[PDB]
């Protein structure tokens, strides 16, 4: 008998504890200070960040800041007490659902209290052990966690690969008639890691051959792809091909909560069956009011999406002009691929921050093979072109030191929060 | 092959759709309007509700409403953009963690974005397929969903029964030595349905005969039980016996989010491993700010808890005086058990609302067996004794008509929202 605490204590605490030791406050859990935007303060110094997922610049929008301040003053954050079924239902929650459904072009929408929870329970509600899933290998964690709720069969197809898909689809369809069940395909509109867009058009094209249901997570696509920001589905003209459309307020909408879209009969079922919404609190009113304003601005200002993509093409082409390796990305997500070890990537970053005033996260060995280094650059419509130029310039300096072994000469910096204790 | 949409379109949509047709807006998704409190408006009429779980009356506390309004004005509702590990970490999140851990008397706390997914992931990283879980049969849905992620063995013990417990620990410990793993017990501090309390003091006494770890969901106990509202653990004086203490802001705290408490080494492990925290947005600042005020008020005002329990004892004893059945509740939860069918329960409630101005939910046949009718009465420190007397009076009238047979003479009322469409 290995006691649970004992195993987690040292046997599990030791390997990842080293990362915590030197990263807490700097490489993990940084503390950005100030109003939300490209220009914030880190550790006493003003900096230019590319780490926020706020694509449309709505976070510090004066109109958004008013609506947020006004809704909280009127309703407080106590807001609709209790779950939506029990006591937390308001006409404002229903107005936002009507406007969201109208925007993305489906019958109905259900305002969710949180994205991660919502996904877990849509996957829970759609699936029965008879049915069979086919999901993209790069699926977000909430999709994976929702899939672990399923006692049925699951088939994983290689990332955005229509050959493994069509292939695994045949295994699903074979198992589906044997088990007397249906088949469900889950992919994303915009994959946040590599930045590539889900090939939705080629996936609905496969609906001619295999007879399936399609679930799409457009968390990174809403406000950013398609007509006026309507998302990746609109971008491919497949809004009718996607049966269930999931979306979150975290990324473009600069906020909290989520919504799922589809036909009225199904959204109503989800209303009465989604455990994560039956048995947890309703989305607060201040968010509801603020989301109403945010959705108003996205509708009224299609310029925000344009300006974002102007920064996207400028940054992406500018980086590719100077031999920087941007991944296979058709979205604003701009990851910069490089080579090096932990002491190189760590020292690289403190050079970018303490010397060039550039703030970005890095993806390193715990996630990506040792030797790989990804700078995660996320352009927002709040960025300027001076921002783009300064960053590419500072990136160019930083690369010369990396390729010239200068960072390999230095040890891992010690920049963790003073006072942080691992035990 | 049964298409997933067809399995739910008419086959799964038919039975519960009738409930939706007549309940939506009245019995299913009521729209309480006004400031949060015992006296709000429903369908044009002012009413006295017992439906919100704001035990300490903090929701509309002026100091709380200022803190909420002030934090939103300063930070907006987007203020911690991105997940906590990436960009959403703030010193205010860490202040609230330090104050919460100090209150409930554990080493460390991790502020979560939402209780439901928080639980799903604390169960996630606590367990491996070798370990074995013993959980109370009445566990909340998020606990159930949480251990559906567990690919190992699970043993369910009968509600608050220390004999069916011991038998399953014996089965667990036996399987734990064969599988070379540990044991974990999950129960609740206050069970929200029947109102009865978890026998925590006894549960930790079983730690003499078996070596397990204990996880407790105090969602209904915080602010409500124990010294100054410290919760059910403090109420039994077994805070040291609870290894992992989960809690939510949705009930007494009158808000959004949650927190888990325990030793620093574990809370740090959870900080770096909880999927629902790594891969979802951080708790907004206005809530952080507000939660700091709410925790200040709880510490500074221990009569909020006493005023609550004065209303509890008055209401419960008054109902027991008049032969109403309150059940086995130890907590503020006051469920009133009665007998009847759906047309009786529904017309009972219409009478309570449209004639007596009393707002409460009912639990009906899909969940509890046909025959029982429980009114869910939730007392709150904002309730008056006049509130208690009027309700018991109205309850006494309503009961004479129920046992008399008047309600059985009427059909199921039609009171759903005009405009709601089932499909
Ligand atoms: C309220 C509730 C939760 C969830 O809290 P939320 O923050 O609303 O998700 C978890 N467990 C229990 C017992 C609850 O009553
Ligand atoms: C951020 C994210 C979510 C979750 O959004 P939250 O509201 O923060 O929980 C879900 N799916 C994807 C792809 C995401 O990037």
Author numbering:
A (entry chain A), B (entry chain B): 1 to 423
Lines quoted from the article behind this entry:
The histidine tag is not visible but the rest of the polypeptide sequence starting with SulA Met1 through the carboxy terminal Arg423 are resolved. There were six molecules in the asymmetric unit with an average R.M.S.D. of 0.4 Å. The SulA protomer resembles an open fist with an extended thumb and contains three domains: an amino terminal domain extends from the ball to the top of the thumb (residues 1–60), a compact core domain represented by the bent fingers (residues 61–301), and a carboxy terminal domain that lies along the back of the hand (residues 302–423). PLP is bound to the central core domain that consists of a seven-stranded β-sheet with six parallel strands (β3, β4, β5, β6, β7, β8) and an antiparallel strand (β9) and is flanked by α-helices. PLP is coordinated by the main chain nitrogen atoms of Gly115 and Tyr116 from the amino terminus of α4, the side chain hydroxyl group of Thr248, and the main chain nitrogen atom of Lys281′ from the opposite protomer. The α4 positive helix dipole participates in neutralizing the negative charge of the PLP phosphate and the positive α5 dipole terminates with a parallel π-π stacking interaction between the side chain imidazole group of His140 and the pyridoxal aromatic ring of PLP. The PLP ring is also coordinated by the side chain carboxyl of Asp217 interacting with the pyridoxal nitrogen atom and the imidazole group of His220 and the pyridoxal hydroxyl group. Dimerization establishes the active site by forming a surface to enclose the active site and creates a hydrophobic cleft that leads to Lys251 in each protomer. The distinguishing feature of SulA is the presence of Lys281′ in the active site instead of an alanine residue found in the equivalent position in the Spt enzyme superfamily.
